Amino acid sequence: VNSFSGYLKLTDNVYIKNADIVEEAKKVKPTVVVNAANVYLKHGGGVAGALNKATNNAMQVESDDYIATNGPLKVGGSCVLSGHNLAKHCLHVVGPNVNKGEDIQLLKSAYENFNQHEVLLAPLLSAGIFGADPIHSLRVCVDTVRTNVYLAVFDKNLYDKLVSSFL
Numbered sequence: 001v002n003s004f005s006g007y008l009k010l011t012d013n014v015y016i017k018n019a020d021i022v023e024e025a026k027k028v029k030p031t032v033v034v035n036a037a038n039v040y041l042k043h044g045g046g047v048a049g050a051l052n053k054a055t056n057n058a059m060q061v062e063s064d065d066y067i068a069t070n071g072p073l074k075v076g077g078s079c080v081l082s083g084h085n086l087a088k089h090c091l092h093v094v095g096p097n098v099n100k101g102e103d104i105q106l107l108k109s110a111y112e113n114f115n116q117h118e119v120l121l122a123p124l125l126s127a128g129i130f131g132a133d134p135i136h137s138l139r140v141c142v143d144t145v146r147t148n149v150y151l152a153v154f155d156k157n158l159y160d161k162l163v164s165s166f167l
């Protein structure tokens with residue numbers, strides 16, 4: 001028994017809620033929040049910018065030090081950094097950005113990073129400004145992640161469509 005509330009059970013291990021992931025993290029303070037990162041950990045907009053803004057830019061400062069030491073992530077890859085005021089840890093995961101010509105087949109590799117963590121609060125990877133169809137992202141999530149994932153989907157209309165069309 002954990003502290004997530006009002007999630008709709010989609011599968012054995014996937015739950016879903018209409019919520020802004022930033023607001024959910026501030027309330028729950030989960031062990032792991034997933035960021036929709038890019039390989040440079042440049043969190044200017046989207047989920048990353050919203051999460052980073054909620055940390056008063058401390059996420060960006062930590063991220064810049066990480067990149068200066070380690071270089072960029074791979075598309076499909078991840079790193080674990082601090083969760084600041086939002087979580088114990090932030091798992092920065094790079095889904096493919098369709099708008100940049102990245103291979104959608106890398107979405108499954110991106111979701112595999114979630115399996116290293118027992119429980120996560122997460123958005124749908126490659127959604128929003130990453131340009132993939134959320135319905136596909138949810139299918140890959142369900143078919144790839146075996147650990148307990150709590151999906152916070154910002155758009156109420158997208159949320160309703162995700163649930164209603166779920167197989």
Ligand SMILES: CNc1cnc(C(=O)N2CC(c3noc(O)n3)C2)cn1
Nearest residue numbers: 020046047050123124127128153154
């Ligand atoms: C001000 N707070 C926020 C929160 N989120 C975003 C964002 O860019 N997105 C992409 C959206 C999404 N649709 O589905 C899934 O899983 N995520 C959520 C921006 N600002």
